[PDB]
């Protein structure tokens, strides 16, 4: 059998007995075949419905207990066996099971002892009976329990970012059934940025919270803090959903969605105007975004007809998410909490944003069609259909009841997207996976991302360039090195994926679905330098981490034995020139221009050998993979020599060699050289323009302002005529016009 064989039988008996009572009485015999087709999240709901009408069947109840045993949910499996046993006492083997499971999970309660006594009298002195007798004894005493707790706490003092240890603390709290302390630490720990990124931790967070909700302790204590803990569950669900989608398979991700949707429906009813309501707002968006990402995962593997329909469906999901407004940040109790919530908001808008674009670039106003056709409530049922099995009750599912009202159907603005990204750099702990995705998403757009601003948000007060550039010691790491690094990681990543699809769209993949986009070498480096800077390394591993970084520095700075293809160096050079040429301050201009000249000075020797059609000495285990896809050709050499000569002139101007800079700039009639010529002619005029000074000099001063006006006009004249020149502008066109207005009124 398969999935088709069992889900097609749904319509077989549905057409023979359509009333609700008989539809549910077939649940056990429906569930009979899903247990065989390896569907346990589905089989669970089928049998549970038959139990809703046939609540006195010992066979059905045991079958659910046996299914919860495979799910390893001890508390749920035991109770199911209990019902089957109390209905039918002749089920001896179940009395053993109950005693077997009660003694394995926890002995603190005498209930495990009681069921063991009965199990003994049903199987006099059987081999299992003693086995259970030894198991019950194993558990430690009061002094023993306190002893373990101190280890974890003393262990957590110096290792607060250890996933396993914090998990054990929640399990120890749960073993003493002081769940309030379990959630309390669970709540104070959702502020940890590292733990929030841990898949296994968030899974434990979902359970320890749910356990507390149903726990007797939650009701007795009070109903005031009930809302507070409920927020964290939603937060945990969001984090858990992001991670499950990337690592886990299609089946597991879909199942988590149902728990997410169940939580949303249970939360929306309370409402209010506090942190929980604001949290519900932001989490609502995440749901669709991840749901859209989930949709695209299925379609990737599937055929073309499903791909378009699913991508159409996903496009709507991301749209719903993007529309959701920025959550009310002021409304939260604390700075940490509110800052977190906004960080996630930026993540939602950023990820969904780029996806919305990459899906809309496929066709003309593709977004408009998506809304006009599927914004209809008919889409709401087509969405629920593709994601979930229709058998589940469509009433308590948040997805089926949401009011899809007035979808903005407005494509995102790039400027808004940049500030969303920058604000969400710390969303996923700056994993090189995160940044390499963003960097690639901007690779198809006409505006480039503020990478240097990303790094400033991550490594605060890290100087743009280090004074002690002579050595490669990793205490001299600079934001330039990182910026230079990320550039290669993305330039490398793009080429690797380009090669992959050629053998077999690359932009369209969502962030969770795609696999590692960087080499494990690159990832190891970034994780090292990250742990080092933020001061979350290990005294023992310091020397190792320190050396791992040092190894690659000589490559990021194009020093001895750099594994750098000439094209990547050129790419670094121009990308830094134009990055620096748009900066306002001199410190940054100088730095970025210096490095650009540096890489240029290293390439030109290579280009000359390539200019005569010779061979480049290929590298030894390069840090940035070489590719013949972008190997430099003679057709482009003369351009680089020219574009490089500009970078030389620019730095010459910044250093003071104006005479040599102008002589070079004037040699080449380029749009960029005008903006430079003008900007420096304007400064020589403005300073001397109004102070009391020799009249002849004043006329010479004015003469420069006359040259400034002319060069700006050449820019706009040549700019309006041709689009290719508009893209060469070192600054925006409107910025050029802005100066001109002030230049002439002077």
């Amino acid at each position, epitope marked *: 059998r398969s999935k088709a064989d069992v889900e097609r039988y749904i319509a077989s008996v549905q057409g023979s007995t359509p009333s609700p009572r008989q539809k549910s009485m077939k649940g056990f015999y429906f569930a009979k075949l899903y247990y065989e087709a390896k569907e346990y999240d589905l089989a669970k709901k089928y049998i549970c419905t038959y139990i809703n009408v046939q609540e006195r069947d010992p066979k059905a109840h045991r079958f659910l207990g046996l299914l919860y045993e495979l799910e390893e949910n001890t508390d749920k499996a035991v109770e199911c066996y209990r019902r089957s046993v109390e209905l039918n006492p002749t089920q001896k083997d179940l009395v053993l099971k109950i005693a077997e499971l009660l003694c394995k999970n926890d002995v603190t309660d005498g209930r495990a002892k009681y069921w063991l006594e009965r199990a003994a009298k049903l199987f006099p002195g059987s081999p299992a009976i003693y086995k259970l007798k030894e198991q019950l004894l194993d558990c430690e005493g009061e002094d023993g329990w306190n002893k373990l707790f101190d280890l974890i706490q003393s262990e957590l003092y110096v290792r607060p970012d250890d996933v396993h240890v914090n998990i054990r603390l929640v399990e120890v709290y749960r073993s003493t059934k002081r769940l309030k302390d379990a959630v309390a630490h669970c709540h104070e720990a959702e502020r940890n940025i590292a733990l929030r990124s841990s898949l296994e931790w968030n899974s434990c967070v979902v359970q320890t919270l749910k356990e507390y909700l149903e726990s007797l302790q939650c009701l007795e204590s009070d109903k005031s803090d009930w809302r507070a803990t409920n927020t964290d569950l939603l937060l945990a669900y969001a984090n858990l959903m992001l991670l499950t989608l990337s690592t886990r398979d299609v089946q597991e991700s879909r199942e988590l969605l149902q728990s997410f949707d169940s939580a949303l429906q249970s939360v929306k009813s309370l409402g209010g105007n506090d942190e929980l309501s604001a949290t519900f707002l932001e989490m609502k968006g995440h749901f669709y975004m991840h749901a859209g990402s989930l949709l695209l995962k299925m379609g990737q593997h599937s055929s073309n007809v499903q791909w378009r329909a699913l991508s159409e469906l996903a496009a709507l999901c991301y749209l719903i998410a993007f529309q959701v407004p920025r959550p009310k940040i002021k409304l939260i109790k604390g700075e940490a909490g509110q800052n977190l919530l906004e960080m996630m908001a930026c993540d939602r808008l950023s990820q969904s944003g780029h996806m919305l674009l990459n899906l809309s670039r496929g066709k003309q106003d593709f977004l408009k069609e998506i809304v006009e056709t599927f914004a209809n409530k008919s889409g709401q049922s087509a969405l629920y259909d593709a994601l979930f099995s229709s058998q589940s009750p469509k009433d308590t599912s948040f997805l089926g009841s949401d009011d899809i009202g007035n979808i903005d159907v407005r494509e995102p603005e790039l400027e808004d997207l940049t500030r969303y990204d920058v604000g969400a750099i710390r969303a996923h702990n700056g994993s090189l996976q995160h940044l390499t995705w963003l960097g690639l998403q901007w690779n198809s757009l006409p505006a480039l991302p503020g990478i240097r601003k990303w790094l400033k948000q991550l490594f605060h007060h890290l100087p743009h360039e280090t004074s002690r550039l002579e050595t490669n010691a990793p205490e001299s790491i600079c934001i330039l090195d990182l910026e230079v690094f990320l550039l290669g990681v993305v330039y490398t990543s793009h080429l690797q994926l380009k090669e992959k699809c050629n053998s077999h769209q690359p932009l369209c993949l969502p962030l969770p679905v795609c696999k590692q986009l960087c080499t494990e070498r690159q990832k190891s480096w970034w994780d090292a330098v990250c742990t080092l*800077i933020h001061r979350k390394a290990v005294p023992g591993n*310091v020397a190792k981490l320190r050396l791992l970084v040092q190894h690659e520095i000589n490559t990021l700075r194009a020093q001895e034995k750099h594994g750098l293809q000439p094209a990547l160096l050129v790419h670094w050079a121009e990308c830094l020139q134009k990055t620096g040429s748009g900066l306002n301050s001199f410190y940054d201009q100088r730095e970025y221009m210096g490095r650009s000249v540096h890489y240029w000075k290293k390439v030109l020797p290579l280009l000359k050998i390539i200019k005569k059609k010779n061979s480049i000495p290929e590298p030894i285990d390069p840090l940035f993979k070489h590719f013949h896809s972008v190997d430099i050709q003679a057709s482009e050499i003369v351009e680089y020599e020219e574009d490089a000569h500009i970078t030389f002139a620019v730095l010459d101007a910044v250093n003071g060699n104006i005479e040599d800079a102008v002589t070079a700039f004037e040699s080449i009639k380029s749009v960029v050289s005008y903006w430079n010529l003008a900007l420096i002619f304007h400064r020589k005029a403005e300073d001397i323009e109004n102070d009391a000074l020799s009249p002849e000099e004043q006329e010479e001063c004015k003469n420069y302002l006359r040259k400034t006006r002319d060069y700006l006009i050449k820019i706009i004249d040549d700019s309006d005529s041709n689009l290719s020149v508009v893209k060469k502008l070192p600054v925006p066109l409107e910025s050029v016009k802005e100066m001109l207005n002030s230049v002439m009124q002077e």
Partner: antibody, heavy 129, light 108 residues
Framework: EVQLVESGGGLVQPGGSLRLSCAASGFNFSSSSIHWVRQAPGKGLEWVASIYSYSGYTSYADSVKGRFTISADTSKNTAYLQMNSLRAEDTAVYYC??????????????????????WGQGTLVTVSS | DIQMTQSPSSLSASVGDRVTITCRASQSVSSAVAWYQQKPGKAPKLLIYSASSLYSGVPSRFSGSRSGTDFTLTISSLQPEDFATYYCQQSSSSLITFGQGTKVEIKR
């Protein structure tokens, strides 16, 4: 261009709490180990706390163990000395200082710092009811 | 616990003298000792690190030396600006301890 500024001092009642701030600038705060050294009036130098350079494992003198807590923030490029259960004995001038990773060695049984190069002006803390 | 016993507690000398201060480590300690100069009320400044290595910027008349478990600061020719209190410091495993200090009073 390189300096350390102490703040967060002032007077407090015994059994109270204070928090000192050691603001650093000019050297990479990540690769530096941070220390605190108090000095009562007319008395000598007493080491009270340390922070290993690249990770930040704490270590305190038994005279203040468990009461004080020293921390380092990369985003704010600043270290702090949280003081609780302050006693009249804690009245002293509190200095902070750094020790680069070049001078920070880790050994079996604990770590050592070769010397304290950069020192601060020193912020006063008086503890008297 | 390791202890650094500094001697003498108070010293009196005049300009040009060759002055000596000594600190003894109770247990056998490796060469991870330092020396500091603290003028009244100001901050302590580093003179010698790693027992006998001079801190960049310190005058050449200062010199450190060790003999067994006894560490010694040596000033070849005392100057007027060196009349201040000095301290010796050991760095053992996850612990730092200072000597009682030595005041250098001008003799008259």
């Amino acid at each position: 261009e390189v300096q350390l500024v102490e703040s967060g001092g002032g007077l407090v009642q015994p059994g109270g709490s204070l928090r000192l701030s050691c603001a650093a600038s000019g050297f990479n705060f990540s690769s530096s180990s941070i220390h605190w050294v108090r000095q009562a009036p007319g008395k000598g130098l007493e080491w009270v706390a340390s922070i290993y350079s690249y990770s930040g494992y704490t270590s305190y003198a038994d005279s203040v163990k468990g009461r004080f807590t020293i921390s380092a923030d990369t985003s704010k490029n600043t270290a702090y000395l949280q003081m609780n259960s302050l006693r009249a004995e804690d009245t002293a001038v509190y200095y902070c200082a750094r020790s680069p990773w070049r001078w920070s060695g880790v050994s079996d049984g604990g770590f050592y710092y070769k010397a304290l190069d950069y020192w601060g002006q020193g912020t006063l803390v008086t503890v008297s009811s | 616990d390791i202890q650094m016993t500094q001697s003498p507690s108070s010293l009196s000398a005049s300009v040009g003298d060759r002055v000596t201060i000594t600190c003894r480590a109770s247990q056998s300690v490796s060469s991870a000792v330092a020396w500091y100069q603290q003028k009244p009320g100001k901050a302590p400044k580093l003179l010698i690190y790693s027992a006998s290595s001079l801190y960049s910027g310190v005058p050449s008349r200062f010199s450190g030396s060790r003999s067994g478990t006894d560490f010694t600061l040596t000033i070849s020719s005392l100057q007027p600006e060196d009349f201040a209190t000095y301290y010796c410091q050991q760095s053992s495993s996850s612990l730092i301890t200072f000597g009682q200090g030595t005041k250098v009073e001008i003799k008259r």
